Amino acid sequence: FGTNGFDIPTIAIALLIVGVIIGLSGLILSIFATATASAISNPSPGTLAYNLTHPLINGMVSFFSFFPTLYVLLGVTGIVLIAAGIISIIMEKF
Amino acid sequence: FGTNGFDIPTIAIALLIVGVIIGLSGLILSIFATATASAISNPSPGTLAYNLTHPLINGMVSFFSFFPTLYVLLGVTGIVLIAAGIISIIMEKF
Amino acid sequence: FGTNGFDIPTIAIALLIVGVIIGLSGLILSIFATATASAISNPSPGTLAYNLTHPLINGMVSFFSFFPTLYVLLGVTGIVLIAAGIISIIMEKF
Amino acid sequence: FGTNGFDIPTIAIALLIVGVIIGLSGLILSIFATATASAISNPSPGTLAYNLTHPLINGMVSFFSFFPTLYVLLGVTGIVLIAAGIISIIMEKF
Amino acid sequence: FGTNGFDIPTIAIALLIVGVIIGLSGLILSIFATATASAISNPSPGTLAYNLTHPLINGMVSFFSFFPTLYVLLGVTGIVLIAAGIISIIMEKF
Amino acid sequence: FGTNGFDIPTIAIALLIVGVIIGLSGLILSIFATATASAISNPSPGTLAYNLTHPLINGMVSFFSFFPTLYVLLGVTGIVLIAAGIISIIMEKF
Amino acid sequence: FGTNGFDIPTIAIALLIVGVIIGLSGLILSIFATATASAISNPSPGTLAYNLTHPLINGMVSFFSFFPTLYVLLGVTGIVLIAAGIISIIMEKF
């Protein structure tokens, strides 16, 4: 059901796969982050360990705040792909 | 029952296949998302784990909100295909 | 009973085949959709699982609402085919 | 049924083809425009996204408002063609 | 249905193609611009980041304000093409 | 749909591409500039580091203030291109 | 009584076999689950053994709640098989 490489069943299967992969990734990351939060403690506001550890958790927070826009762009990509498929069908179907 | 590659039984079978695939995909995604919702907890509004986990669920929500328009375009594609078939029949049947 | 490829018995057989295929497809889709409806539950209006699952059922609804016009065009195609056959007969029968 | 290239059956078939093509085009455009209208939202009257998006929908509206006169001229062309055919018949039929 | 290269079905197909392409482009641009608006924040009116970022969004706004007249001229082009076709038909049809 | 190299679908695709590229560029620049603003600190008004660092941020500000007119001219270029296309069509279509 | 591999007696025998197997499986599972329920006790709501044992019975409950949809799909499969057989008969019986 297509013309050259655009196959609606294949597209549906790809959507299935990407959705399940993203769900698994989110699950694993949340489960691991809970363990991270449990492991690290709060020594004191101004002692040696605070200076030793604070920037690391800052970097953690920053990177995890960068994740959302990555996911948004990844989602955007599929609309472009489907649109290109539709245009390719229309071009030489007539 | 066609002229070159347009076969009404084949079209009906293709519609059958795509419908069943989409149904299965929705079923699997809902079943898995229920497990995801059960697994992840809500630690606190402002502790370390919240900073660690919130953007991930934000990305989840965004991608899953992107799904609907993907499905809509996928549905639109079939009308174009059937229309191209009709035009191709009319062109050289007379 | 024809001139080149237009055979009334063949046309009747083709109509038989397409009708039975469409009936089977509708039967299977309804039976499977009942199972889909039974499987998925309604967690809550505003919790995590709702955000996780709602757009999927929205896409389900949209695609299944797209089906009717597909069926209508598929039905329209046969009138065109029979008309082309009649014209082809008339052209060189005299 | 003609003299050189003017064939009344051919003209009727051409009218059939153009009518069906225009109908299909209008159908597809309306169906797709409904999806476009559903997809785009209204963020706010004066925020960043409004400045980012408004001229695009303005261009959409303008082009789609240009369509009608295109269709009108396309319709006008057929009268000219049929008239030229009639004149050509009259010129050397006598 | 034409004389040399002017084909009414071809013109209708071209109109179909351009309309669908413009719709897709507007859709993609709006969807992406929403993500852009979400990503960039408003640091402060007078700090370093404001000086660093403001002219960029100014250029964004300017270019997107330039789009409308581009679309208008693109729409105008088709009337010229159809008119040239009509004149070419009239010139040597008689 | 053109005469030699002027193709309305190609023009629309080019507009799509340039718009998306400009959006991506603005996004990346804003995201990076936020990091720049976060990284550099304000030592003091008159110490060694101030003399060492101030002209650099001055140059940053100047260049980023130069960007807007660059974008404006880049936008202007497209109107010229489309106009040249229209004139070229008109010249030898008649 | 068939054409290639579709044999109505064979289908009836297969239905017999699957029905009896499913009945036996349900019987054995219920009989064993009764023994499981008898064996495990309820120590206390909050002591060590409760923490040690509760998630296991939770997993038991979850998996056994997953069984029903598995059975439903297994039942659905037979309608598809019989339908494919009917279509295959019709295709080349005429």
XYZ file of C-alpha atoms in Angstrom:
658
model
C 0.000 0.000 0.000
C 2.307 2.695 -1.314
C 4.366 3.747 -4.308
C 8.116 3.305 -3.631
C 8.988 3.233 0.077
C 6.012 4.920 1.711
C 4.026 2.137 3.398
C 1.209 3.034 5.784
C 1.532 -0.229 7.783
C 5.273 0.388 8.056
C 4.614 3.931 9.274
C 2.180 2.661 11.902
C 4.698 0.054 13.062
C 7.393 2.725 13.281
C 5.111 4.905 15.401
C 4.443 1.911 17.649
C 8.169 1.280 18.055
C 9.129 4.879 18.809
C 6.297 5.317 21.297
C 7.234 2.177 23.191
C 10.929 3.113 23.194
C 10.200 6.578 24.575
C 7.964 5.103 27.267
C 10.637 2.616 28.329
C 13.283 5.348 28.394
C 11.175 7.615 30.586
C 10.381 4.722 32.915
C 14.027 3.722 33.327
C 15.187 7.307 33.817
C 12.585 8.022 36.496
C 13.340 4.776 38.329
C 17.071 5.466 38.287
C 16.666 9.120 39.268
C 14.722 8.049 42.344
C 17.728 5.956 43.391
C 20.068 8.878 42.697
C 17.958 11.181 44.864
C 17.928 8.597 47.651
C 21.686 8.012 47.540
C 23.049 11.566 47.717
C 22.618 13.397 51.030
C 22.774 17.063 52.059
C 25.907 17.502 54.213
C 25.750 21.207 55.109
C 25.454 24.677 53.499
C 29.084 25.762 53.526
C 31.271 22.825 54.517
C 33.775 21.022 52.308
C 31.393 18.385 50.948
C 28.951 21.053 49.773
C 31.645 22.741 47.691
C 32.660 19.279 46.495
C 29.187 18.153 45.397
C 26.894 21.087 44.536
C 28.005 21.794 40.923
C 27.467 18.137 40.018
C 23.794 18.246 40.966
C 23.589 21.597 39.181
C 24.776 19.920 35.986
C 22.308 17.088 36.539
C 19.464 19.593 36.785
C 20.602 21.515 33.706
C 20.914 18.483 31.424
C 17.588 17.065 32.543
C 16.035 20.456 31.856
C 17.507 20.269 28.352
C 15.727 16.960 27.652
C 12.213 18.432 26.978
C 13.073 20.399 23.836
C 14.956 17.375 22.507
C 11.776 15.339 22.871
C 9.720 18.099 21.244
C 11.948 18.230 18.160
C 11.978 14.436 17.962
C 8.189 14.544 17.887
C 8.187 17.291 15.254
C 10.308 15.166 12.899
C 7.493 12.694 12.227
C 5.118 15.306 10.821
C 7.821 16.316 8.343
C 8.356 12.705 7.303
C 4.647 12.022 6.764
C 4.262 15.286 4.854
C 7.158 14.400 2.561
C 5.524 11.041 1.944
C 2.208 12.655 1.027
C 3.892 15.083 -1.363
C 5.867 12.266 -2.975
C 2.673 10.271 -3.498
C 0.861 13.230 -5.049
C 3.755 14.132 -7.349
C 3.702 11.007 -9.532
C 0.389 9.349 -8.699
C -1.214 11.577 -11.351
C -11.050 -6.073 -11.028
C -8.869 -3.174 -12.101
C -6.642 -1.906 -14.882
C -2.946 -2.044 -13.866
C -2.413 -2.103 -10.095
C -5.657 -0.698 -8.728
C -7.546 -3.664 -7.255
C -10.635 -3.044 -5.132
C -10.220 -6.301 -3.140
C -6.586 -5.378 -2.518
C -7.650 -1.923 -1.334
C -10.197 -3.435 1.047
C -7.585 -5.841 2.412
C -5.156 -2.959 2.900
C -7.798 -1.012 4.820
C -8.412 -4.087 6.971
C -4.699 -4.412 7.714
C -4.120 -0.758 8.584
C -7.193 -0.599 10.803
C -6.170 -3.680 12.748
C -2.584 -2.440 13.101
C -3.726 0.929 14.438
C -6.066 -0.771 16.899
C -3.300 -3.043 18.182
C -0.912 -0.101 18.514
C -3.394 1.945 20.522
C -4.150 -1.041 22.742
C -0.486 -1.740 23.481
C 0.318 1.921 24.107
C -2.568 2.372 26.540
C -1.712 -0.829 28.406
C 1.936 0.170 28.714
C 1.135 3.761 29.686
C -0.984 2.482 32.560
C 2.081 0.629 33.862
C 4.218 3.748 33.412
C 1.733 5.831 35.394
C 1.667 3.208 38.144
C 5.455 2.941 38.375
C 6.492 6.592 38.708
C 5.607 8.326 41.982
C 5.358 11.975 43.053
C 8.233 12.639 45.490
C 7.682 16.303 46.400
C 7.242 19.761 44.799
C 10.749 21.144 45.170
C 13.078 18.384 46.333
C 15.916 16.834 44.349
C 13.899 14.029 42.753
C 11.358 16.503 41.381
C 14.078 18.445 39.571
C 15.487 15.099 38.443
C 12.236 13.705 37.021
C 9.791 16.452 35.977
C 11.163 17.308 32.487
C 11.022 13.634 31.505
C 7.281 13.420 32.112
C 6.957 16.772 30.345
C 8.568 15.252 27.259
C 6.308 12.215 27.558
C 3.252 14.470 27.562
C 4.499 16.530 24.617
C 5.274 13.573 22.348
C 1.991 11.864 23.143
C 0.226 15.125 22.344
C 2.022 15.119 18.990
C 0.599 11.684 18.100
C -2.951 12.869 17.118
C -1.977 14.951 14.085
C 0.268 12.117 12.911
C -2.748 9.818 12.962
C -4.873 12.423 11.176
C -2.392 12.790 8.312
C -2.024 9.016 8.085
C -5.786 8.808 7.661
C -5.780 11.588 5.064
C -3.281 9.687 2.896
C -5.804 6.999 1.946
C -8.253 9.427 0.349
C -5.430 10.700 -1.859
C -4.499 7.163 -2.877
C -8.073 6.182 -3.761
C -8.557 9.433 -5.671
C -5.399 8.830 -7.694
C -6.680 5.356 -8.488
C -10.024 6.703 -9.693
C -8.340 9.302 -11.897
C -5.995 6.686 -13.344
C -8.948 4.441 -14.176
C -10.854 7.263 -15.862
C -7.850 8.441 -17.878
C -7.439 5.359 -20.083
C -10.663 3.417 -19.573
C -12.199 5.546 -22.342
C -20.507 -12.869 -23.082
C -18.490 -9.781 -23.924
C -16.134 -8.286 -26.477
C -12.547 -8.132 -25.125
C -12.358 -8.208 -21.322
C -15.820 -7.101 -20.248
C -17.578 -10.238 -18.981
C -20.888 -9.913 -17.146
C -20.383 -13.156 -15.153
C -16.912 -11.943 -14.190
C -18.368 -8.609 -13.080
C -20.985 -10.367 -10.958
C -18.313 -12.569 -9.378
C -16.192 -9.502 -8.643
C -19.153 -7.814 -6.958
C -19.699 -10.965 -4.899
C -16.054 -10.990 -3.820
C -15.868 -7.315 -2.869
C -19.134 -7.450 -0.941
C -18.036 -10.466 1.063
C -14.615 -8.937 1.756
C -16.154 -5.697 3.011
C -18.557 -7.627 5.231
C -15.737 -9.680 6.744
C -13.647 -6.555 7.321
C -16.466 -4.757 9.108
C -17.166 -7.832 11.224
C -13.538 -8.234 12.291
C -13.107 -4.530 13.020
C -16.231 -4.361 15.180
C -15.281 -7.510 17.090
C -11.775 -6.214 17.742
C -12.962 -2.719 18.666
C -15.218 -4.218 21.322
C -12.139 -5.829 22.885
C -10.241 -2.536 22.660
C -13.064 -0.700 24.423
C -13.158 -3.364 27.133
C -9.398 -3.318 27.710
C -8.709 0.401 28.168
C -10.032 2.002 31.362
C -10.685 5.599 32.437
C -8.111 6.461 35.135
C -9.051 10.051 36.021
C -9.634 13.486 34.416
C -6.305 15.151 35.121
C -3.867 12.576 36.470
C -0.738 11.300 34.743
C -2.357 8.364 32.943
C -4.963 10.639 31.364
C -2.263 12.830 29.830
C -0.479 9.633 28.808
C -3.456 7.996 27.080
C -6.020 10.546 25.838
C -4.413 11.570 22.498
C -4.153 7.914 21.475
C -7.902 7.379 21.733
C -8.346 10.720 19.972
C -6.337 9.390 17.035
C -8.349 6.171 17.097
C -11.573 8.163 16.839
C -10.242 10.368 14.040
C -9.016 7.522 11.826
C -12.201 5.533 12.300
C -14.155 8.648 11.371
C -12.067 8.846 8.196
C -13.107 5.320 7.149
C -16.640 6.220 5.854
C -15.573 8.426 2.942
C -12.998 5.809 1.955
C -15.802 3.265 1.708
C -17.968 5.713 -0.244
C -15.276 6.332 -2.863
C -14.570 2.606 -3.088
C -18.247 2.092 -3.859
C -18.239 4.905 -6.421
C -15.401 3.255 -8.365
C -17.590 0.382 -9.567
C -20.080 2.623 -11.361
C -17.186 4.162 -13.289
C -15.870 0.732 -14.247
C -19.252 -0.528 -15.466
C -19.833 2.702 -17.384
C -16.464 2.397 -19.112
C -17.369 -1.158 -20.051
C -20.691 -0.075 -21.548
C -19.039 2.691 -23.564
C -16.359 0.304 -24.811
C -19.023 -2.166 -25.932
C -21.000 0.514 -27.762
C -17.935 1.972 -29.482
C -17.065 -1.029 -31.666
C -20.146 -3.242 -31.472
C -21.598 -1.203 -34.353
C -18.057 12.534 -35.412
C -15.939 15.513 -36.388
C -13.654 16.874 -39.077
C -9.996 16.857 -37.922
C -9.604 16.795 -34.134
C -12.945 18.079 -32.884
C -14.784 15.041 -31.497
C -17.970 15.542 -29.490
C -17.518 12.289 -27.498
C -13.944 13.334 -26.735
C -15.172 16.743 -25.577
C -17.753 15.130 -23.301
C -15.112 12.808 -21.849
C -12.805 15.770 -21.255
C -15.584 17.613 -19.428
C -16.172 14.506 -17.316
C -12.480 14.306 -16.434
C -12.061 17.972 -15.526
C -15.220 18.012 -13.425
C -14.165 14.957 -11.456
C -10.640 16.319 -10.962
C -11.948 19.638 -9.654
C -14.319 17.844 -7.291
C -11.526 15.662 -5.914
C -9.255 18.682 -5.478
C -11.882 20.630 -3.557
C -12.617 17.606 -1.380
C -8.960 17.030 -0.506
C -8.309 20.713 0.166
C -11.299 21.050 2.490
C -10.403 17.869 4.373
C -6.807 18.993 4.824
C -7.768 22.549 5.781
C -9.948 21.180 8.567
C -6.872 19.427 9.975
C -4.829 22.620 9.621
C -7.458 24.605 11.517
C -7.537 21.965 14.251
C -3.753 21.828 14.624
C -2.858 25.511 15.013
C -3.925 27.195 18.259
C -4.341 30.826 19.336
C -1.585 31.575 21.884
C -2.297 35.213 22.788
C -2.796 38.663 21.188
C 0.644 40.165 21.698
C 3.022 37.480 22.936
C 5.986 36.040 21.054
C 4.129 33.177 19.370
C 1.557 35.569 17.913
C 4.274 37.614 16.217
C 5.840 34.326 15.128
C 2.696 32.828 13.577
C 0.198 35.495 12.453
C 1.670 36.418 9.022
C 1.694 32.747 8.019
C -2.057 32.401 8.482
C -2.431 35.749 6.719
C -0.652 34.303 3.689
C -2.815 31.189 3.889
C -5.945 33.337 3.787
C -4.661 35.456 0.901
C -3.698 32.540 -1.351
C -6.948 30.714 -0.688
C -8.794 33.916 -1.539
C -6.873 33.992 -4.823
C -8.141 30.515 -5.781
C -11.690 31.582 -6.892
C -10.676 33.715 -9.876
C -8.290 30.967 -10.978
C -11.225 28.564 -11.052
C -13.371 31.105 -12.905
C -10.797 31.574 -15.671
C -10.289 27.816 -15.901
C -14.023 27.481 -16.468
C -14.016 30.274 -19.051
C -11.372 28.473 -21.131
C -13.762 25.705 -22.189
C -16.233 28.056 -23.866
C -13.374 29.438 -25.960
C -12.283 25.942 -26.957
C -15.784 24.843 -27.981
C -16.309 28.086 -29.893
C -13.057 27.605 -31.798
C -14.186 24.093 -32.656
C -17.527 25.331 -33.981
C -15.852 27.999 -36.107
C -13.364 25.474 -37.476
C -16.204 23.133 -38.430
C -18.143 25.897 -40.174
C -15.107 27.190 -42.069
C -14.506 24.137 -44.272
C -17.677 22.081 -43.893
C -19.181 24.172 -46.709
C -7.635 18.928 -23.940
C -5.375 21.708 -25.154
C -3.242 22.848 -28.062
C 0.493 22.532 -27.246
C 1.226 22.469 -23.508
C -1.866 24.042 -21.980
C -3.816 21.183 -20.382
C -6.751 21.968 -18.101
C -6.390 18.707 -16.106
C -2.686 19.451 -15.689
C -3.513 22.962 -14.480
C -5.999 21.594 -11.952
C -3.438 19.068 -10.709
C -0.847 21.830 -10.377
C -3.282 23.917 -8.334
C -3.930 20.889 -6.127
C -0.201 20.385 -5.583
C 0.604 24.010 -4.777
C -2.334 24.335 -2.396
C -1.360 21.219 -0.482
C 2.297 22.282 -0.334
C 1.397 25.711 1.033
C -0.887 24.144 3.632
C 1.829 21.746 4.783
C 4.374 24.567 4.961
C 2.108 26.746 7.082
C 1.327 23.814 9.365
C 4.988 22.939 9.911
C 6.004 26.559 10.461
C 3.279 27.168 13.043
C 4.077 23.939 14.888
C 7.781 24.758 14.990
C 7.212 28.390 15.972
C 5.191 27.235 18.967
C 8.227 25.241 20.118
C 10.489 28.246 19.526
C 8.220 30.462 21.622
C 8.174 27.863 24.394
C 11.952 27.408 24.423
C 13.183 31.006 24.668
C 12.564 32.802 27.970
C 12.554 36.465 29.021
C 15.587 37.000 31.294
C 15.267 40.692 32.200
C 14.912 44.158 30.595
C 18.498 45.368 30.765
C 20.748 42.502 31.824
C 23.394 40.800 29.704
C 21.157 38.090 28.243
C 18.671 40.679 26.988
C 21.382 42.472 25.018
C 22.560 39.054 23.845
C 19.173 37.814 22.612
C 16.813 40.673 21.677
C 18.034 41.438 18.112
C 17.658 37.770 17.171
C 13.950 37.747 17.980
C 13.696 41.099 16.204
C 15.061 39.482 13.048
C 12.673 36.564 13.495
C 9.737 38.968 13.644
C 10.922 40.946 10.619
C 11.426 37.939 8.337
C 8.110 36.401 9.322
C 6.468 39.740 8.592
C 8.076 39.625 5.145
C 6.440 36.260 4.364
C 2.905 37.614 3.564
C 3.814 39.627 0.465
C 5.850 36.678 -0.804
C 2.731 34.532 -0.571
C 0.643 37.229 -2.262
C 2.980 37.454 -5.258
C 3.149 33.665 -5.473
C -0.636 33.642 -5.691
C -0.634 36.403 -8.309
C 1.647 34.366 -10.592
C -1.053 31.802 -11.381
C -3.463 34.339 -12.864
C -0.705 35.456 -15.233
C -0.006 31.871 -16.268
C -3.666 31.064 -16.951
C -4.093 34.323 -18.860
C -1.083 33.552 -21.045
C -2.574 30.141 -21.739
C -5.908 31.646 -22.773
C -4.221 34.144 -25.087
C -2.089 31.406 -26.636
C -5.190 29.305 -27.288
C -7.044 32.209 -28.893
C -4.099 33.224 -31.078
C -3.960 30.112 -33.276
C -7.244 28.335 -32.576
C -8.821 30.522 -35.276
C 4.289 24.506 -13.583
C 6.652 27.075 -15.042
C 8.595 28.005 -18.152
C 12.349 27.381 -17.674
C 13.416 27.288 -14.018
C 10.620 29.131 -12.241
C 8.594 26.460 -10.425
C 5.958 27.511 -7.899
C 6.228 24.248 -5.892
C 10.004 24.680 -5.826
C 9.587 28.258 -4.605
C 7.240 27.127 -1.839
C 9.685 24.405 -0.793
C 12.517 26.940 -0.744
C 10.464 29.243 1.477
C 9.772 26.300 3.784
C 13.479 25.487 3.994
C 14.654 29.038 4.664
C 11.986 29.631 7.297
C 12.869 26.460 9.165
C 16.600 27.211 8.961
C 16.119 30.715 10.348
C 13.962 29.370 13.170
C 16.563 26.760 14.108
C 19.340 29.357 14.007
C 17.469 31.739 16.289
C 16.660 28.903 18.682
C 20.269 27.726 18.907
C 21.630 31.252 19.302
C 19.216 32.111 22.111
C 19.908 28.842 23.928
C 23.660 29.346 23.679
C 23.490 33.022 24.649
C 21.665 32.067 27.835
C 24.617 29.833 28.736
C 27.056 32.631 27.892
C 25.184 35.049 30.149
C 25.177 32.487 32.956
C 28.890 31.715 32.648
C 30.434 35.197 32.720
C 30.274 37.068 36.035
C 30.667 40.727 37.023
C 33.930 41.023 39.001
C 34.004 44.737 39.871
C 33.793 48.207 38.250
C 37.468 49.110 38.072
C 39.558 46.074 38.969
C 41.847 44.136 36.644
C 39.267 41.612 35.438
C 36.899 44.391 34.373
C 39.557 45.931 32.134
C 40.333 42.416 30.915
C 36.755 41.457 30.016
C 34.566 44.497 29.254
C 35.513 45.125 25.580
C 34.747 41.495 24.737
C 31.141 41.791 25.881
C 31.004 45.138 24.081
C 31.933 43.384 20.841
C 29.361 40.682 21.551
C 26.662 43.327 21.928
C 27.724 45.172 18.776
C 27.763 42.114 16.506
C 24.436 40.870 17.815
C 23.017 44.330 17.183
C 24.286 44.049 13.607
C 22.310 40.828 13.033
C 18.841 42.469 12.537
C 19.626 44.372 9.335
C 21.282 41.250 7.934
C 18.030 39.377 8.486
C 16.027 42.226 6.948
C 18.089 42.228 3.748
C 17.921 38.436 3.581
C 14.143 38.732 3.709
C 14.134 41.460 1.057
C 16.017 39.218 -1.390
C 13.051 36.884 -1.889
C 10.735 39.603 -3.187
C 13.347 40.463 -5.815
C 13.645 36.823 -6.851
C 9.883 36.322 -7.184
C 9.556 39.590 -9.099
C 12.277 38.547 -11.536
C 10.449 35.269 -12.035
C 7.171 37.041 -12.786
C 8.840 39.368 -15.285
C 10.584 36.447 -16.976
C 7.272 34.610 -17.309
C 5.527 37.646 -18.785
C 8.332 38.389 -21.246
C 8.007 35.258 -23.396
C 4.666 33.772 -22.370
C 3.034 36.060 -24.952
C -13.919 -31.320 1.534
C -11.830 -28.308 0.599
C -9.522 -26.907 -2.050
C -5.884 -26.872 -0.836
C -5.553 -26.937 2.958
C -8.932 -25.706 4.156
C -10.747 -28.774 5.506
C -13.973 -28.325 7.463
C -13.505 -31.575 9.455
C -9.960 -30.480 10.278
C -11.257 -27.092 11.423
C -13.851 -28.748 13.653
C -11.198 -31.034 15.144
C -8.946 -28.040 15.781
C -11.781 -26.242 17.566
C -12.357 -29.363 19.662
C -8.677 -29.510 20.603
C -8.328 -25.840 21.525
C -11.521 -25.852 23.575
C -10.453 -28.896 25.555
C -6.957 -27.483 26.109
C -8.335 -24.186 27.402
C -10.717 -26.021 29.723
C -7.914 -28.165 31.140
C -5.697 -25.112 31.619
C -8.382 -23.208 33.502
C -9.108 -26.247 35.660
C -5.458 -26.771 36.592
C -4.872 -23.080 37.282
C -7.904 -22.793 39.558
C -6.991 -25.965 41.449
C -3.420 -24.789 41.961
C -4.450 -21.250 42.909
C -6.654 -22.658 45.656
C -3.575 -24.368 47.111
C -1.574 -21.144 46.796
C -4.264 -19.203 48.654
C -4.347 -21.850 51.380
C -0.568 -21.932 51.815
C 0.266 -18.237 52.225
C -0.879 -16.577 55.457
C -1.366 -12.954 56.536
C 1.336 -12.170 59.129
C 0.556 -8.546 60.029
C 0.031 -5.100 58.428
C 3.440 -3.548 58.997
C 5.837 -6.200 60.268
C 8.852 -7.592 58.432
C 7.066 -10.478 56.711
C 4.482 -8.121 55.218
C 7.196 -6.032 53.570
C 8.829 -9.294 52.500
C 5.733 -10.834 50.895
C 3.214 -8.203 49.737
C 4.727 -7.250 46.332
C 4.822 -10.917 45.322
C 1.069 -11.321 45.723
C 0.674 -7.974 43.961
C 2.524 -9.386 40.958
C 0.404 -12.533 41.115
C -2.756 -10.432 40.967
C -1.456 -8.287 38.107
C -0.414 -11.183 35.865
C -3.646 -13.058 36.471
C -5.526 -9.882 35.598
C -3.554 -9.770 32.345
C -4.754 -13.263 31.359
C -8.300 -12.246 30.193
C -7.269 -10.092 27.230
C -4.825 -12.802 26.162
C -7.722 -15.247 26.035
C -9.875 -12.735 24.152
C -7.265 -12.221 21.430
C -6.697 -15.971 21.200
C -10.416 -16.360 20.572
C -10.408 -13.560 17.995
C -7.704 -15.317 15.955
C -10.036 -18.118 14.853
C -12.513 -15.800 13.140
C -9.642 -14.371 11.096
C -8.483 -17.848 10.109
C -11.951 -18.996 9.026
C -12.492 -15.757 7.112
C -9.204 -16.186 5.260
C -10.266 -19.712 4.376
C -13.603 -18.521 3.000
C -11.934 -15.823 0.906
C -9.387 -18.307 -0.427
C -12.175 -20.688 -1.432
C -14.127 -17.949 -3.201
C -11.080 -16.607 -5.044
C -10.398 -19.646 -7.243
C -13.544 -21.749 -6.920
C -15.033 -19.674 -9.756
